Amino acid sequence: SMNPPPPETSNPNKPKRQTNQLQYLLRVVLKTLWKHQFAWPFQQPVDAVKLNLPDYYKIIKTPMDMGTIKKRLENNYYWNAQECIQDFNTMFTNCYIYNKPGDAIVLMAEALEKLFLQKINELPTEE
């Protein structure tokens, strides 16, 4: 029952900038994936205490959720869009790995990842 503290969202030493890619990801991709009706399990970090999953964090070594991504985008933690895309794919990969294929949460993650990949090809070049 570790339930490790959620990933850090703000870093005062880290520089703050609002590139075109990051503000697009925050104002388009994250808003769309947040107002979706399959997004509630990823709005919050996996509370392994409630769900009684003592093996989630022992298998998932790099946890991630869309709420952490939101709090990182709002604090300008990201320097480039590669970090945000890596975090999104890390969340999707953790959800795929821990569960068995064909489960409900797996299909919801597949839906969200398909929408994310069809919304990420619309990536405008930096200003």
Add this chain to the structure above:
Amino acid sequence: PNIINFDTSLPTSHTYLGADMEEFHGRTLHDDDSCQVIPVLPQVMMILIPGQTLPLQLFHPQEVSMVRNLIQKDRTFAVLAYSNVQEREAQFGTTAEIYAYREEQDFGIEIVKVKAIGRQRFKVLELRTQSDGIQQAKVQILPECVLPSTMSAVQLESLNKCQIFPCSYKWWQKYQKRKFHCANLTSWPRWLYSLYDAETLMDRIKKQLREWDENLKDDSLPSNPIDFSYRVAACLPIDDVLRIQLLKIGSAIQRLRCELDIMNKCTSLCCKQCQETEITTKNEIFSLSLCGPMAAYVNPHGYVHETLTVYKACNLNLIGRPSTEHSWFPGYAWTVAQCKICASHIGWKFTATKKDMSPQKFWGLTRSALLPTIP
């Protein structure tokens, strides 16, 4: 208590299921005692009652393929009433005819939202799991055993001209003394056959239902005794075992009798897991949907909960902030409700968004978590 200005048609519309669906006006009704082979949905663990509107949200490719198959044929699927659902043990059930469907694109995966209605009770004869995984069921339809007037056998040939009738309890005493007169020819009196008459029990249940639903009995309640009994059973907050025992009843007279007996006895609703924590009372039950105070609803997860709307609810803790996302009652926000002792999920406290609305706050409890109790 308070007054209401919500306009209740929206609960029945299930506006949370996207936009306007593709409505079907046809009706497929099979004959009595006719054994049909019907597919069974996998993720439906509900004891459906005829007439009860059932919403569904399915996204499994297996589920969507079966739905596309059924839309092309007769739009009828079986809903098993499981005695022990941990092993899919079914003996009774109720058919459900689809009347609205909507597949949604610009969406991650292929998903279909459906509104169906219960049709015909049935007994389960054979449950066969295909190589696909989806299961079929060979199934005998159960007939509606409506019995004739209990005095038509005794009836005097000369009194046949007095069997048509052109301060309510005076009228009911007149009705009793005029209809069941020939009871003096039997070993039992008139007030005993009044307990087994259809209209007397219907009026008693109407008196009991005027407490909850403020809609007049002129149009909202059905006229047929069988339809009336089914409409009453659709909104009876009882556990699964008693709902099974109620669906077993074929004769509508015994259905109405057991319904009024339950309404007389069960006064308090406690938590099912606690068994010793009063959640609410029958007096606080008020109707917010046209279907009644308790109606079935579906969430984005895909689960179907039988929500009963009450004015007050005791012994409950509140979890989470209010949220209007996929709210079953438009204009209100829900908040998770746990039991005060076992923390089991009991329902949701629905609070109004606009301040002009009424009621400003009510409760919607799921039927699966409640248990009726007599003091």
Add this chain to the structure above:
Amino acid sequence: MSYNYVVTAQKPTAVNGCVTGHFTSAEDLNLLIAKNTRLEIYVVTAEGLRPVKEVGMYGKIAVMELFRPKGESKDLLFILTAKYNACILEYKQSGESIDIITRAHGNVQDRIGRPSETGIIGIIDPECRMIGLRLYDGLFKVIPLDRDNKELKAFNIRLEELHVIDVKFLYGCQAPTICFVYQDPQGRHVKTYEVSLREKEFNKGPWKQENVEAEASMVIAVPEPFGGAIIIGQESITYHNGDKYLAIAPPIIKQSTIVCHNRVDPNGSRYLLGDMEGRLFMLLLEKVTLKDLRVELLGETSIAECLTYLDNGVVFVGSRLGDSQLVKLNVDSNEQGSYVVAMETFTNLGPIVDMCVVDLERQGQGQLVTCSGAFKEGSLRIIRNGKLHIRTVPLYESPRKICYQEVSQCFGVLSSRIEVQDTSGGTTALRPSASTQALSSSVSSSKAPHETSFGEEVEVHNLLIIDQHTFEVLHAHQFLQNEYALSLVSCKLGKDPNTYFIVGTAMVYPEEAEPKQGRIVVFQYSDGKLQTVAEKEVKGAVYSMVEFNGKLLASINSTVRLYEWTTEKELRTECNHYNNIMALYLKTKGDFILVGDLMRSVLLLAYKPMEGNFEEIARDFNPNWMSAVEILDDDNFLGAENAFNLFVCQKDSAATTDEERQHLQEVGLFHLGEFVNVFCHGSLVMQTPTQGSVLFGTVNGMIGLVTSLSESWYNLLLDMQNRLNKVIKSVGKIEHSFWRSFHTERKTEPATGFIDGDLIESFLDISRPKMQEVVANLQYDDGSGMKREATADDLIKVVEELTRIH
């Protein structure tokens, strides 16, 4: 797997319809009487009547009308049965061998249609052009009366007026015209139609619709030269004939609703009317067109089910609730102010609601004491075989229950009389009954918003202790206000050697649908006075009580409770049993207890003396209205149900599976034709192929006996019935298997596990050639194990042994 034998010990005595005409001959005057499943023909003489023929049919006579089409010498008889078997019959007499030949027959039952609330309504056109049948709502069936219609083909016509109350064919019209009273949301109306045979439809009538009385019940077709139709309700007797519109409102008929009528003068100048309470009025029509209507109270007859005017001024009154009457109508009132004088009384044992078997005179010669009749026609009937001697004790109040007490040499009878609200404050009796003329009479002690009304009826229940020898109302104890007596037992309980009358009651109130309060009261009778010994309150109605091994088994709504008799003379609860149904029927046998609901819900429990409570053995649920239950034996339980039917259920003690040990197999079904009421153990013959004897009473006065047979005897009797159905002609040619088939409108099955005794006992009536034909190639006497051939004398001896059980 039932093996049962039912036999009729008393043919039905109730009269459910009668007519007059010229059936046997044109010069004769014939009176035809219907007794449910019996038809009686008489020739009217100046003496009174003369019995010429009595026949039995395979159907309950619902419609019975006489008519003569243009071309016949004498009248023909149309008859419809409860199973919708229609037949037109003719009389034939050659010397002494009389035969009722079938002129036409047919099954007119449609494939679809809900039976109407007014029942079967069969009428005939004056010019004999068609026969009209009202069976289903919104469907009028027509049978054209032509010389070729031998299968009785009928066609349906649609009605816009769904709820039809009554209908009659009008007199004096070119086209066959019907006049009927119907109801719509606007009120009750009368309307006429013209039935077309070319178009098979309806045309507008000779006069448009009228808005009549809200309680317009009866319609009378007036013959020429008057014409038109009379509409009679509770408060107005109007008349319509084209433009002729006459209306009266005589207050003399406001005291009771008129039910039946009959035509006196063939031209339609005088009519007899009978109300519910039995009053007989005269309706006079005064004279090209009608002048005025007048109602004059002739007198007081029995509660008339039907009326008919013979001749000489003699009238016959058929009554189901009481004895049938032959009366005389004088032209001058007597001393009491009546025009009616009784001439003769015909016995009518219906309705039988309870009875008991006693060894009265001879020890062994059993006699049956039955509570018969209702209202002023109520009575006690003492029946013993000599064909059957019957003693009548009229009580002038409705009886309900009855039992016998041997040590006190008396009978306990539950009765109820009707009283009206007093003008000041109380109740007043309409007539002095047995409860208001007893040698001693007391009331009970003790343990009501919106009280009384303006002149409404109320029931008052009494327990009457009556001597077995003199039949004088010894004691008439009255119960409490707003109380209904249900059960009655006479027994000894505990170590107390005193025999007690135990009565169960129920507090019935206008606001309470189901009674939540009741009493169990224990009386003792001695020295010509009744003292209330014990009283115990319960939370419901005490529908029935039973003596159970020195204890008292009572039913209180949905509860079965056992009471012990303490030394302090108080009822002490031992063990309860809570069920899913309200225990209406209670029966016992040793340690088995049988519980029955109104909707055929059967339960069988067993008492556990070492454990001290009740344990569920078996049960069965098949929704159908019931009436009476009886325990045949350990594994056989008999009952009656809707549509005049009997059934027998079996259990399986050993059996195989615990899930199926708790089920009752429907091993026997049968269609009786009489609504059964109360079964009871006993036998009327001096004290074998049979084992057991249970008598049963019915509504139309019929009394029967049920007994148990073996396997070989059951198979032999089934073969005998199958053989006798072929050679015996049926009145109207109705199939015997179609008559004895369990006929409910929800399901129709053949009869199994039951041997009809009336068919087996008619074996001796036919001639010897038919005997040698029926016994031909039998050899189903599998009693020895192999085949035993049969002869005629063997079967004659066997049948005469089967006639020596009743």
